[PDB]
From a paper:
CCs are quaternary structures comprising two or more α-helices supercoiled around each other with cyclic (Cn) or dihedral (Dn) symmetry. Here, we describe variants with all combinations of the aliphatic residues, Ile, Leu and Val, at a and d to give four classes of peptide: the ββ class, with a and d = Ile or Val; Lβ, a = Leu and d = Ile or Val; βL, a = Ile or Val and d = Leu; and LL, a = d = Leu. Peptides are named systematically appending the one-letter code for the amino acids at the a and d sites to “CC-Type2-“; e.g., CC-Hept becomes CC-Type2-LI. In summary, solution-phase data and X-ray crystal structures demonstrate conclusively that different classes of Type-2 coiled-coil (CC) peptides—i.e., based on abcdefg repeats with predominantly hydrophobic residues at a, d, e and g—adopt a range of distinct states.
Author numbering:
A (entry chain A), B (entry chain B), C (entry chain C), D (entry chain C), E (entry chain A), F (entry chain B): 1 to 30
Write the structure that this text describes.
């Protein structure tokens, strides 16, 4: 269940990453 | 239990990331 | 039950990520 | 031995990712 | 060890992602 | 055994990603 809390954490980070790259994409179209 | 749930969470984040990287790629061809 | 399902879902998200990376790699080539 | 070490290393990489996301979020604000 | 092959896979993908974002960064400075 | 090794691999990739996201953030302030 420690392995699990770390993978929960990674999944939260990757979600924020995906959000950021979406905002980056939006500003690069213009 | 915990782990399966973590892994579902991780999978979801990863499809979100993949989508945003297609959007990033599209904004750069754009 | 829950677990092996989690792993089939992770495995699909990983391929989606791998195809999006391939598209981002290509859009970064001129 | 090997395993718990693996997990302390993952846990540090997750914070580094979280601080880099915070810097990327801020550079994406004007 | 199936969980392990999936995490090996994710680590390979995230490595390529980090590569791409480096090339994206290089082209955005100019 | 396998899992600890996967997790070491994952951690390494994640520090590489964090670095590249600092470089991306820097190129956008740039």
């Amino acid at each position: 269940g420690e392995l699990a809390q770390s993978l929960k954490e990674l999944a939260k980070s990757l979600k924020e990453l995906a959000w950021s790259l979406k905002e980056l994409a939006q500003s690069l179209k213009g």
